[PDB]
Design a protein around this ligand. Structure first.
Ligand code: FES
Length: 128
């Protein structure tokens, strides 16, 4: 039950690559904020945003029922289990690797994922 969360905003701000500089690995040498990069440990049956929230990590959330994408993320690798529902578009689960962190649990041992997907330029336009 090991995972590595990464700040999607840090990837853009720094202007790094998605998997070229191996942020999940080079990040440990940057000592960035723990709320941006770190190894998230979650057992089977435990919600990510929940296991990380008990450590000090922060995640975007609004519906908290797996019916919206505010808590959207970007799994860079591994696999996560979802509930009986699918509000996101497979394109986001395959082209953006987005998942539900409020109601999503890791089904693999090691998994990579970026937290705070709301930073995506596709949503930033929602700003009023
Ligand atoms: S907070 Fe709505 S799907 Fe996660």
């Amino acid at each position: 039950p090991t995972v590595e969360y990464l700040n999607y905003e840090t990837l853009d701000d720094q202007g790094w690559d998605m998997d070229d500089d191996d942020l999940f690995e080079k990040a440990a040498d940057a000592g960035l904020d723990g709320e941006d990069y770190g190894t998230m440990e979650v057992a089977e049956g435990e919600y990510i945003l929940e296991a990380a929230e008990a450590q000090g990590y922060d995640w975007p959330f609004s519906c908290r029922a797996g019916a919206c994408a505010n808590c959207a993320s970007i799994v860079k690798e591994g696999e996560i289990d979802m509930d009986m529902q699918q509000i996101l578009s497979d394109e986001e689960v395959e082209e953006k690797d987005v998942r539900l962190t409020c109601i999503g649990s890791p089904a693999a041992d090691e998994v990579k994922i970026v937290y705070n997907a709301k930073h995506l330029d596709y949503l930033q336009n929602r700003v009023i």
